[PDB]
């Protein structure tokens, strides 16, 4: 039933095919809803999707600096089509600091984690995150074992440097007394991308997110 | 009166070849820098590089007028219809030649017109031309509404096209050379069309004592014909 | 920062503006051009191009029978054979031209325009016929002795069977009254009239009955002007 | 009863019949209603509405780079005046990808199709779409078919190598409670305008979208 | 020109819908809209300009259209020989400049409002010639320039 | 990008602003100038 | 092959490519064996004849363990059709 | 100040877009780049 149909490709030169521009595409992260936990809170990896972890993982090591665009939404419940013009807050924590347990936590003045305050009907927030790992280069894959210790044992192919910090998003403005959801988007555009040592392409299905187990098809 | 002679063929004309190089355009080959990045054609300049006069046609005063599509006029005609039929890619240029034999009695004028990627239409209906309505091989085909061509647009506008005029009073021949006409490098000859060669009868054929009924010949040849490799060594 | 301040029309957005923006495949590469052959770089390019008039204005005639005009032993001389009016915009023997066409698409024209008459007797078939000119606000002549006391070429289309008319120049435009609803239409340009000098003369064993066909083109000093919409096909109602 | 009126029409230079100002004009090429299918899709085509049409068939062969700008509108129903400043997300899906069927579908993640994040109160999205096609030029007219099988033979004038693309726009904020329909306005400017082999304009009704049949009057 | 636009509402919160404009310019060679959703909106040949109520007022520069070398202030004459050009002394149809149609693209909403445009006009690269006494007499009507008492 | 703030008046439209608009015709070709007598630069040469 | 897999993340490619073979027999083990390229558009040989009527290379792996073969080009993209739902589908682009 | 104005697509976010942003650790000054070897620069040189 399929038509056989061909064309004269006709096309020259190898810039598409640049390794800035394989890994370097902007590409949703995370997608999380919370109706005002209370807040959003999600360590930063680009092994969410199955789509970028495998793009990814077609190197051993990768060094790029992380574009951040954060497109939040709102949607009302039960009567006007006014949205609210909240203030949102969104604050990047290093590897190296507490992360918030509370709305009204004490770490979101941390004066030294960066912070972004932007409104829900502005252009969306967008911030660079350079390259922050102790190593040269992130590790996709890392055959060995974070210590010694017996509970170090059950953590095979978890590097502690391999993390890439917390992205922790509150609505500033205080409870309103309609119901609301947020609906927050991540988008990471890697820069400056630097890759080495490339790797056979996964064939098989995940089976976690964390230890490169295959299972059946 | 000259000769118009390619390959081992030759016509007998009437020293009106003055020849229309369509859009002043001389049908030359695919050029260096635009082969580089697709597939390498070889050039068989064998014997298809000759004329192929089709079966003469009658003109009569009812007459609408006829059309031939290229290369589906020579797509099962000798050494051109082997390579076609053995080769998937395919790159040429056409010489298109129509000749009228009539008395200084005779009167009437034909409108030969190329038209390229004259896409055929139908007549108060929906659905797009079936596969016989198109591809009607050398025998050609015979317009419906000459007044229209077939598509909806004037004739009276398709002068803009490379044409020639044959006024039996002044001339009996045409000769349109037509370059290769495609958005693409090269093209497959077995289900794409690039030139349609139509010949109107504007003024209608008439006389009194004649013999109601004149013969028109087609020739064409094509020029610079181009195919894939198909013995390019794998060691 | 740049201290900048707002203008009126900031955020506005005009269907003619000029600007740049985003590319959304930045690294896309495309197809590299090759040579194609008929290459348009002006409009003007089409309306310099002969393309037939229909001539035929007699009512009735359908078809092909409006592109030619009969001339037969049965006409006498002298009649009048065909009129066209030299305006692009109004029903005639030019509103089916390229160049009437293409100028639809525009309100101002103004240039030179090329006709052409062609001959589709029989070889020995012969006879005269006067071909005349009327220059903008004069009156179409009526009969054979008018037209030779104007403009005109005596044509004897027995030697030759093509004869070129170089009109001078054709002008017209689209206009509105202000404060009145009345429609105001550009007035007539001017006429090309043919009439018989001789009636026609045919051997025996030739066909009693010729035609004579037209062409008509612009020359290269022709222009157009305010681009506008054809209403050639119409028929939308709500921009569905 | 027509005024018989006339001018001294006075003018000269040539500038304006380019045919780069000729077709260079950005025209409406597509409007659609949906109330919150559920979504816009349509592919990209200089054939929906006839006087572009004519235009465009005037040439045979034209290369042209796209411009887009999406003109959103919003009119409630049942009830006070205020409009919700919703969030919209237009996305180009070229042909070789596949195209989203419902609201939430995996297509919207794509990370390779371009999309756009606009609110309604915001300026008109644009974005410029380059020459995609896999030939040198699209083909206004196409005399063949798409290949030998039997269901290609039904597709004559048919060209798979001329389609443009798909865009597709939705609405990413939820469901509001109130009612409310959305009129999405495409106007099309083509840029870097080239064309050949100009052909007989079109003086006849047309029958179908895809046939140049050609009926009475 | 600058097109200021206000809105107003009837009977009810005072929150001003945020509409969208259109205002489109039709030369004289061009056919004007008749209704609301007319065909002449899309005409894609006729300038038009989208704005929105709570943006910054629209603005476009309409060139000199003019057929002649200028606009007459003054026409002595007729447009043509017919009897209907007869009541229409010193009127020449060369000297219109041209229409301007704006609408509310946005939907039928469900309250009710009233919008009130305002046009501002300022010239550009003025040209003027032949100077004339001012008009010392109230004028009778727009177009012929007619005087009464006073 | 080029960081901006903006100012007071930034989308005031005073009637008395001197700046460049949009052109709504931007080949339209206007029509060519001719001589025309008696121009006037200043509104003084009429009261003398 | 890493070609199909990296090729699968593009749409169009055009090129030439590379082919080798191996025989992994014991030393002594001997025998001829013919390897045939069929240009696109092409029937796929169905017998011996047919494939020694057209590029072929007669490979004895007695001699040697290794053949690599060199195809010229090979084309080919992702196609959807304007106005139809019918799926289109690349042609082939010949065989070995 | 600098009399501007906005233009179509002013707020949008496009997912292709090529803009400079806010560095969140403006002196952070990361780890050197040390040599690791198998550098890849093309796509290309996995399909050959």
Same mark, same amino acid.
């Given at each position: 039933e399929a038509i056989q149909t061909r064309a004269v490709i006709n096309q020259h030169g190898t810039s598409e095919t640049l390794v800035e521009n394989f890994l370097g595409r902007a590409a949703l992260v995370m997608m999380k809803d919370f109706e005002y936990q209370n807040f959003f809170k999600w360590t930063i990896n680009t092994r969410s999707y199955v789509q970028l972890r495998r793009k990814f993982e077609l190197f051993t090591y990768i060094r790029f600096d992380s574009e951040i665009t954060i497109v939040p939404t709102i949607r009302?419940?039960?009567?006007?089509?006014?949205?609210?013009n909240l203030t949102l807050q969104a604050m990047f924590v290093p590897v190296?600091?507490?992360?918030?347990?509370?709305?009204?936590?004490?770490?979101?003045?941390?004066?030294?984690?960066?912070?972004?305050?932007?409104?829900?009907?502005?252009?969306?927030?967008?911030?660079?995150?350079?390259?922050?790992?102790?190593?040269?280069?992130?590790?996709?894959?890392?055959?060995?074992?974070?210590?010694?210790?017996?509970?170090?044992?059950?953590?095979y192919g978890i590097n502690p440097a391999?993390?890439?910090?917390?992205?922790?998003?509150?609505?500033?403005?205080?409870?309103?007394?309609?119901?609301?959801?947020?609906?927050?988007?991540?988008?990471?555009?890697?820069?400056?991308?630097?890759?080495?040592?490339?790797?056979?392409?996964?064939?098989?299905?995940?089976?976690?997110?964390?230890?490169?187990?295959?299972?059946?098809? | 009166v000259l000769q118009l002679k390619l390959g081992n063929s030759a016509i007998v004309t009437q020293e009106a070849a003055n020849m229309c190089c369509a859009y002043g355009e001389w049908p030359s080959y695919l050029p260096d820098n635009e082969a580089t990045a697709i597939d390498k054609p070889t050039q068989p300049e064998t014997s298809t590089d000759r004329f192929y006069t089709l079966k003469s046609v009658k003109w009569e005063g009812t007459s609408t007028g006829?059309?031939?599509?290229?290369?589906?006029?020579?797509?099962?005609?000798?050494?051109?219809?082997?390579?076609?039929?053995?080769?998937?890619?395919?790159?040429?240029?056409?010489?298109?030649?129509?000749?009228?034999?009539?008395?200084?009695?005779?009167?009437?004028?034909?409108?030969?017109?190329?038209?390229?990627?004259?896409?055929?239409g139908?007549?108060?209906?929906?659905?797009?031309?079936?596969?016989?309505?198109?591809?009607?091989?050398?025998?050609?085909?015979?317009?419906?509404?000459?007044?229209?061509?077939?598509?909806?647009?004037?004739?009276?506008?398709?002068?803009?096209?490379?044409?020639?005029?044959?006024?039996?009073?002044?001339?009996?021949?045409?000769?349109?050379?037509?370059?290769?006409?495609?958005?693409?490098?090269?093209?497959?000859?077995?289900?794409?069309?690039?030139?349609?060669?139509?010949?109107?009868?504007?003024?209608?054929?008439?006389?009194?004592?004649?013999?109601?009924?004149?013969?028109?010949?087609?020739?064409?040849?094509?020029?610079?014909?181009?195919?894939?490799?198909?013995?390019?060594?794998?060691? | 920062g740049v201290p900048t301040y707002l203008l009126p029309g900031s955020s506005q957005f005009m269907t003619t503006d000029d600007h740049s923006s985003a590319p959304a495949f930045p690294d896309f590469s495309p197809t590299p051009e090759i040579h194609i052959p008929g290459r348009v770089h002006n409009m003007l390019e089409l309306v310099q191009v002969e393309s037939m008039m229909e001539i035929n204005n007699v009512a009735g005639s359908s078809g092909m029978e409006r592109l030619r005009v009969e001339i037969s032993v049965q006409t006498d001389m002298d009649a009048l054979l065909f009129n066209i009016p030299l305006d692009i915009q109004l029903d005639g023997p030019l509103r089916s031209?390229?160049?009437?066409?293409?100028?639809?698409?525009?309100?101002?024209?103004?240039?030179?325009?090329?006709?052409?008459?062609?001959?589709?007797?029989?070889?020995?078939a012969t006879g005269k016929v006067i071909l005349c000119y009327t220059p903008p606000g004069g009156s179409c002549p009526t009969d054979r002795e008018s037209a030779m006391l104007g403009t005109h070429?005596?044509?004897? /289309?027995?030697?030759?069977? =093509?004869?070129?008319?170089? +009109?001078?120049?054709?002008? $017209?435009?689209? /206009?509105?009254?202000?404060? =009145?609803?009345?429609?105001? +239409?550009?007035?007539?340009? $001017?006429?090309?009239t043919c009439f018989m000098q001789t009636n026609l003369i045919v051997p025996k064993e030739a066909a009693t009955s010729t035609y004579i066909i037209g062409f008509a083109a612009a020359k290269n000093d022709f222009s157009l002007r305010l681009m506008r919409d054809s209403p050639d096909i119409g028929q939308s109602q709500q921009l569905e």
């Open positions: 009302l419940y039960t009567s006007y089509s006014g949205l609210p190296g600091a507490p992360t918030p347990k509370s709305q009204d936590s004490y770490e979101w003045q941390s004066a030294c984690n960066p912070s972004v305050f932007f409104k829900i009907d502005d252009p969306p927030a967008r911030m660079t995150i350079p390259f922050m790992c102790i190593n040269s280069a992130y590790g996709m894959f890392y055959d060995g074992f974070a210590g010694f210790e017996k509970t170090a044992n059950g953590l391999n993390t890439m910090g917390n992205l922790c998003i509150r609505v500033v403005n205080a409870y309103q007394p309609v119901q609301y959801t947020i609906t927050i988007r991540i988008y990471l555009k890697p820069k400056h991308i630097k890759a080495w040592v490339p790797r056979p392409p996964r064939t098989m299905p995940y089976m976690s997110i964390a230890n490169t187990n295959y299972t059946g098809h | 006829w059309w031939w599509k290229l290369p589906d006029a020579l797509n099962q005609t000798g050494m051109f219809g082997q390579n076609v039929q053995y080769h998937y890619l395919y790159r040429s240029g056409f010489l298109c030649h129509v000749q009228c034999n009539a008395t200084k009695f005779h009167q009437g004028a034909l409108l030969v017109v190329a038209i390229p990627e004259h896409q055929l139908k007549y108060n209906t929906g659905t797009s031309a079936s596969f016989d309505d198109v591809m009607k091989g050398k025998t050609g085909g015979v317009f419906t509404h000459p007044y229209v061509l077939d598509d909806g647009t004037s004739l009276a506008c398709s002068l803009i096209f490379p044409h020639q005029w044959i006024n039996l009073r002044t001339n009996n021949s045409a000769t349109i050379m037509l370059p290769w006409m495609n958005c693409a490098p090269m093209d497959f000859a077995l289900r794409h069309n690039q030139w349609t060669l139509a010949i109107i009868p504007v003024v209608p054929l008439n006389t009194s004592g004649g013999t109601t009924m004149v013969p028109i010949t087609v020739s064409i040849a094509p020029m610079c014909c181009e195919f894939n490799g198909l013995r390019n060594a794998i060691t | 031209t390229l160049l009437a066409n293409i100028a639809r698409y525009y309100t101002h024209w103004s240039g030179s325009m090329e006709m052409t008459f062609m001959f589709c007797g029989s070889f020995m070429i005596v044509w004897d /289309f027995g030697l030759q069977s =093509s004869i070129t008319l170089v +009109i001078p120049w054709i002008s $017209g435009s689209h /206009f509105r009254m202000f404060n =009145s609803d009345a429609k105001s +239409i550009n007035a007539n340009v $001017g006429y090309v």
